[PDB]
Amino acid sequence: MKELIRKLTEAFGPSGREEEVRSIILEELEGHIDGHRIDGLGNLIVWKGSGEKKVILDAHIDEIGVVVTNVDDKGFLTIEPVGGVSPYMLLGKRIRFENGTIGVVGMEGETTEERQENVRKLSFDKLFIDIGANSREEAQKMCPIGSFGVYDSGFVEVSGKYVSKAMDDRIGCAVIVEVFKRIKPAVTLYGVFSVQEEVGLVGASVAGYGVPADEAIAIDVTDSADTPKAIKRHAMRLSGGPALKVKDRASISSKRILENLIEIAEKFDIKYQMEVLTFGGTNAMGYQRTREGIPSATVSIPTRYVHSPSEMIAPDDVEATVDLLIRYLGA
């Protein structure tokens, strides 16, 4: 699963421009699905099996990123975040744009005091991107207004942990791909690789409309609060297993689905942990609100450094999540 995670996390797919990730997922799934379709927003919907119970597994294919909002007379670019990227994570960083351009992020400040003030209350209004242009006309040919970019950052193994950009949520995508590669479903299994989660759960608010699901399980990251002075009210930690989300700020998981998964994990000796997240949301909200309501839950991968260019997971948690879903859904 290491090379699948490397390929998915390094692929380009900020919210709204997820094509490249979608096509990689399809190539990994061919031979392991019975059919697929792509809807009008770009959600990829795959299926395997013909059981009477119908289940969605959802992971989002978009990552946070930036979009160019303006260009000045010297060729520098101004940007707007795409999803929840902190300007502090961009200082001194490089951005890779959809067309392959690399840009360097710099900060304004006409005096040393101004620079101190700006970093104290950093905002995207004080950042700019340098793509090497020498004029506005040159920059507009290179990377015009509306161009999307992501962190220029890739995958590395760090003493047994995996680190990359976009673990949120290419790690959930990898989980679902591996489930389809291995499972003999007892259900009709739908895999939804949904768009634009980071800008408001857009894809998953419609992807279930045309899927006759009885249940929906979102796979996403959660806060691994096991670093120095981490968030004290979060219990989730690396190597504690899949985290069964009781609640975050966007949904309360179905009690029945959580109980089913707890029963599966205890029966098959899969380590797991319970999750309450005090901020944030996942695509389970979109399925709950679809049509007459699809009962939904989230199973989370504990992740350190979420929304940074160096998100970190423990591979044993990812393998245990795959095992849990196969045991819950497979024949």
**Could you tell me the two tokens for 98?**
């959809």
203 vs 241, beta carbon nearer a copy of itself: 203
Q: 197 catalytic, yes or no?
A: yes
Residues near ligand [O-] (CB under 6 A)? 168-169, 197, 220
Please report how close the Cβ of residue 176 comes to ligand [O-] at its closest, in angstroms.
15
Our CA angle for 102, 107, 109, nearest 5°, is 150
Q: What is the DSSP string of 178-209?
A: HHHHH--BSSEEEEEEES-STTTSTGGGTTTT
Please report how close the Cβ of residue 31 comes to a copy of itself at its closest, in angstroms.
27
54 vs 307, beta carbon nearer ligand [O-]: 307
User: Which stretch, 47-55, 193-201, 250-258, 261-269, contacts Co ion (CB under 5 A)?
Assistant: 193-201
Applying CB under 5 A, which of residues 58, 168, 215, 248 lies at the interface with Co ion?
Answer: 168
168 vs 215, beta carbon nearer Zn ion: 168
64 vs 68, beta carbon nearer ligand [O-]: 64
> Beta strands 273-276 and 243-247: pairing type?
parallel
* Candidate list 28, 63, 197, 275, residue with the active-site label: 197
Binding residues for Zn(2+): 60, 168, 197-198, 220, 307
Binding residues: 60, 168, 197-198, 220, 307
- In whole angstroms, what separates CA 29 from the centre of its chain? 19
Q: Rule CB under 5 A: which of 208-227 touch Zn ion?
A: 220
Please report how close the Cβ of residue 57 comes to Zn ion at its closest, in angstroms.
14
Contact 107, 119 (CB under 8 A): yes
Put the strands of the sheet holding 243-247 in their side by side order. Answer: 35-38, 44-48, 188-194, 54-60, 215-223, 296-303, 243-247, 273-276
**C-alpha to C-alpha distance for 216 and 192, rounded to whole angstroms:** 10
**Could you tell me the two tokens for 101?**
């351009």
The verdict on 311 binding Co ion (CB under 5 A) reads no
CB under 5 to 8 A by kind: which of Co ion, a copy of itself, Zn ion, none does 220 bind?
A: Zn ion
CB under 5 to 8 A by kind: which of a copy of itself, Zn ion, ligand [O-], none does 30 bind?
A: none
Per DSSP, helices labelled H in 109-217 are 112-120, 136-142, 167-182
> Of 78, 85, 123, whose CA–CA distance to 105 is shortest?
78
- Residue of minimal CB distance from ligand [O-]? 168
> Of 325, 302, 330, 309, whose CA–CA distance to 166 is shortest?
309
Applying CB under 5 A, which of residues 28, 62, 98, 168 lies at the interface with Zn ion?
Answer: 168
**C-alpha to C-alpha distance for 280 and 173, rounded to whole angstroms:** 19
264 vs 317, beta carbon nearer ligand [O-]: 317
The verdict on 169 binding Zn ion (CB under 5 A) reads yes
CB under 5 to 8 A by kind: which of Zn ion, a copy of itself, Co ion, none does 20 bind?
A: none
- Residues known to be catalytic: 197
